[PDB]
Design a protein around this ligand. Structure first.
Ligand SMILES: C[C@H](O)CNCc1ccc2c(c1)OCO2
Ligand SMILES: C[C@H](O)CNCc1ccc2c(c1)OCO2
Lengths: 169, 169
């Protein structure tokens, strides 16, 4: 009782692109959108999320900490003050703490990406929400429904508990 | 008829780490190993692969073209001329051709990471075979059996047809 379809970019034998499928999933949202992403600079996908929040959908976004200022800079160039949108909460996640060869203290990255809508459908895979994934790279995603979606819901809650308010805010 | 389990790094409730489960998957190979990977510098996983080859398992490895020299540098430090192992074939895959605003043509990257053993079991996810995924980063994989494995076999064959002999070789 889990069903899975594969999609690719550039696209193969499927009618929609990965980016067009992400837009559809967000337009179809009725209650909640949960997103985990490493880099998010795509203006078209951002515009779909803001529209959903204006309809009354609760939006929770978890971003890799090292790359967060790329997202904030895009939203400001769009004229948007994302801080002011009450139906959206944006928080950052760090990787492990570690010591380098020279003894300095750094943290790694959250290498995770997925989109979870209404606790019933997930898109999971290697596509990041930036221009390079449209024009330069090969990538793939799964569209997932059924019992496995509950395991993504539990992982989202665990990451939300770990996450912090962004330091730039 | 597809079963999927999740594993994390750092580990959550499961006994084995992601790296221990990769080693297990390789040791259990009877006929064929098929690997697609973006960066491969982990000496311990490479030793498992070479040992499988010596017992007569056929090994096919597809690496991101722009990161190939990191693999070659590792195999040379270990004192192994990998190009002399007849049961291993290593080939590279490029991203899309694109033209920058200064006119120069470039290519992007293959962002895809999976291990397929005996056409029957896959590990798919965000874990790359390098020291930073052990010590620094947060990552996750799926362990997949059943009908979905066929779709990973088809994608492997399609990348294998695209791939080239590395230019050093
Ligand atoms: C005013 C009306 O009620 C809603 N406007 C439709 C609409 C406009 C812009 C959009 C969108 C949808 O999705 C992404 O950007
Ligand atoms: C009997 C002979 O030495 C080979 N089998 C033992 C063994 C040695 C080295 C290995 C390994 C297994 O797996 C990975 O590295």
């Amino acid at each position: 009782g889990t069903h899975i379809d594969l999609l690719f970019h550039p696209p193969r034998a499927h009618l929609l692109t990965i980016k067009e499928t992400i837009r559809k999933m967000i337009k179809e949202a009725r209650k909640v959108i949960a997103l985990v992403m490493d880099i998010f600079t795509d203006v078209d996908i951002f515009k779909e999320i803001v529209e959903a929040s204006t309809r009354g959908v609760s939006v929770y976004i978890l971003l890799d900490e090292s790359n967060f200022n790329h997202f904030l800079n895009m939203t400001e160039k769009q004229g948007c003050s994302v801080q002011r949108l009450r139906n959206i909460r944006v928080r950052t996640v760090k990787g492990q703490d570690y010591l380098s060869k020279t003894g300095a203290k750094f943290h790694g990255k959250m290498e995770q990406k997925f989109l979870l809508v209404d606790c019933q459908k997930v898109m999971y895979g290697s596509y990041s929400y930036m221009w390079s994934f449209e024009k330069a790279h090969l990538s793939m995603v799964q569209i997932i429904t059924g019992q496995l979606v509950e395991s993504f819901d539990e992982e989202f809650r665990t990451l939300y508990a770990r996450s912090c308010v962004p330091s730039s805010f």
